[PDB]
Symmetry: C3
């Protein structure tokens, strides 16, 4: 029950700023107090500081930041702590997942997102890296990436060892990549048909039939519906509801196999207040904005927070 | 993959105006662009122009309009195009369904609505025709209808060949008609018990056990909850949510047997904005009002639009 | 089909006033008209007027009020009427349930609430009695309660004969009491996993395997999500939705075994308006605040109000 906290305030994978503020906001809202009350101990590492594709925006900053995160996270993973990586946009999952993967070669990844993040630079509508991070992590890139030379000899994640859950906003070319690479995916319609519980059980059975693999959770908060998670940059209608995302995190916690996690795309500047109701009983700041509070509650779920 | 578009701006089946504006609003919002991007071809026909019961409001206008729609739609159906009939209030479904039925004698009808629309003139609380249209189509009327003489020798729809889905606001007498005529109905409580997916599968198995019949979808947008579809004249609490109505249309599209469809009761004047989020990726006008946008997205589902 | 209506305007189990106004507000909104239209007859009794633990707030007022309610309700129960007890905060369920229990010794209780109300005075964070009422009713109190001497020789409710449904906001010590006393409980996560229908069926099978026991429903309106029930003092995120709470009440009505019911924690002063939509068709005041209207609709469900 030791968690290393790593702030990864990278905001270069997409146009906007705001997400760079996520890590410190969550600390302000009571991250340490929440971890404490759940009976975990933490080590807060602070914040990460900061032939070829030529069409990836801000790639220099991203590559240099990612090397730093890769190195820092590798060191925390070696302590056999649970490692919590707080973004930042989703670009931070490349180094997060690959560092975890080098240590846990049988790692299984649950990517929770409204989006596929599985564009390659030649299919991307935007040139924004956060929309390509999963493709990059999966080894789907066809050319070298400037400032990622340090990463070229790493082992990459395999599609069959991954499940994407909650998706509903996929680009035209992206749809083809999704089917082609054989990744396991569960759309919001699958969730509507079968319920979130059956969906995650199905996903886990698919990628870890023997229930014996370490799990990395990469949670993009925009997987959650706008009603509950307004504080994020790229919204898509029809998301996971409050009950669903909480149940999903609880089920993943109960595997007892989660070794690392990203929580990405929280943008405090975009967030709103309810606010404070009696049920906000974790040691979270009164009247905290609702997405920040949800982030902390979802982190609590992964650390074993339960209704009874 | 050819669709005929028929605008049916009838607003006489109920008190309000607004719905007469629906057809052109949907065109403005990007109807043609949406059909194009899905790889369908369209022919836009434009807009329909315009012993006895004595207690039906505006019946002259309704009867005369319905003859015109019957004739116009009959002609489009003969091309073996998919025919999309955009209302207008629900009164336009009488001619829509009966013209389709004369051509497709084994037609099965899925009536998606918060209401039964199955009052007869002697049970109607309002005298508004849009609340009687299904009863009329089913041959449940007991007297002749002024200005409907042209329709008296048509074959009428049978209750056992129909399923009403999503209902929750039914008048006292209407409840008796519903049980008496033996129509298949699936209330919002059935949907809550079994989920939208099991419900539509059950309905389809009930009315088309051999999966071999052409299908007409009559979609009243007020079937959808107020939260997602404010732009409609007669609201009822506890409607289909965004995920449910999208899944329902997708499942119906996947039968590959849908030959015609009404989309009725959209009232642009009553509609509101979110607005524009990243997930609004169909070629729909940026910041379009949310019900209009939903209408277009639901039309896209029927034409095969899917998440991946 | 005779219902006795008892107004129990007790507000001393918690800090706030507002709930004392609930009973008369529901009458103003059309309680009698609703009962009438459902074909029930009512007798409106009006409103109840008004070694040891030393840490229970307002206990004198609560104990004295509870004796009065116990006596009044005992008398109504003897008529073999369905007895509807309208709070007031949840403190009124002690006398309600115990009076019903003395008459119906095989009573089964369905406690519908976001909270456990199962603190004992030595674990209570607040000293507010409404958060202890279920523990008190279950005989879990360890010391005598001032002004409850009249109750000391009553038979208390047993945990195995009780099901709590909808819970999501439970205090730390309370979680231990919940597991220890062996009460049957179904959290919002159980509801999310299995659906409200499977949950209530499971609960009923658990506590009444032979489907032969009288049922008391203790409905705290804060079980319902904030979106639908803002007019209540202690809100918790992720509650039952409009479709769920309506279905739950319908299923309980259909047992045909409900003999008594509390509807508690409605605070008109906290309530808001939609307002009036076509679907508000029960004889409820036009534009009534939404929680009050929901209360009446849920009472209608218990008296057999159904979609068709
Ligand atoms: N598919 C879009 C949207 C990406 C959204 C990124 B994410 O999931 O981290 O918010 C793009 O490639 O630009
Ligand atoms: N049952 C009511 C309401 C009808 C609603 C019509 B509809 O479904 O087209 O909105 C009436 O007969 O007036
Ligand atoms: N557990 C809290 C909250 C109680 C809420 C009471 B109720 O369910 O009637 O709203 C307390 O003991 O103070
Ligand atoms: Mn993402
Ligand atoms: Mn995303
Ligand atoms: Mn209709
Ligand atoms: Mn309708
Ligand atoms: Mn309560
Ligand atoms: Mn409560």
């Amino acid at each position: 029950k030791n968690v290393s906290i790593i702030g990864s305030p990278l905001a270069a994978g997409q146009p906007l700023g705001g997400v760079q503020l996520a890590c410190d906001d969550l600390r302000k809202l009571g991250l340490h107090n929440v971890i404490d009350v759940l009976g975990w101990k933490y080590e807060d590492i602070g914040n990460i500081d900061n032939c070829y594709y030529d069409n990836i925006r801000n790639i220099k900053e991203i590559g240099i930041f990612s090397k730093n995160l890769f190195d820092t996270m590798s060191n925390e993973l070696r302590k056999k702590n649970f490692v919590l990586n707080i973004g930042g946009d989703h670009g931070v999952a490349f180094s997060s997942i690959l560092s975890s993967l080098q240590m846990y070669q049988n790692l299984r990844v649950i990517w929770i997102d409204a989006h596929g993040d599985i564009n390659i630079p030649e299919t991307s509508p935007s040139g924004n890296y956060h929309g390509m991070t999963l493709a990059h992590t999966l080894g789907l890139f066809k050319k070298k990436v400037p400032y990622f030379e340090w990463s070229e000899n790493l082992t990459y994640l395999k599609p069959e060892n991954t499940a994407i859950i909650g998706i509903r906003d996929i680009d035209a070319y992206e749809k083809i990549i999704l089917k082609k690479c054989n990744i396991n995916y569960y759309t919001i319609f699958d969730i509507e048909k079968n319920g979130i519980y059956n969906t995650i059980c199905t996903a886990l059975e698919k990628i870890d039939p023997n229930s014996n693999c370490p799990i990395h959770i990469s949670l993009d908060i925009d997987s959650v519906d706008n009603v509950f998670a307004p504080g994020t940059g790229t919204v898509a209608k029809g998301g996971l509801n409050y009950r669903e995302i909480n149940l999903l995190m609880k089920i993943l916690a109960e595997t007892k196999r989660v070794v690392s996690m990203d929580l990405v795309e929280y943008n405090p500047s975009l967030d709103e207040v309810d606010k404070k109701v009696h049920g906000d009983s974790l040691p979270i700041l009164d009247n905290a904005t609702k997405t920040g509070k949800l982030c902390l509650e979802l982190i609590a779920r992964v650390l074993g927070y339960d209704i009874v």
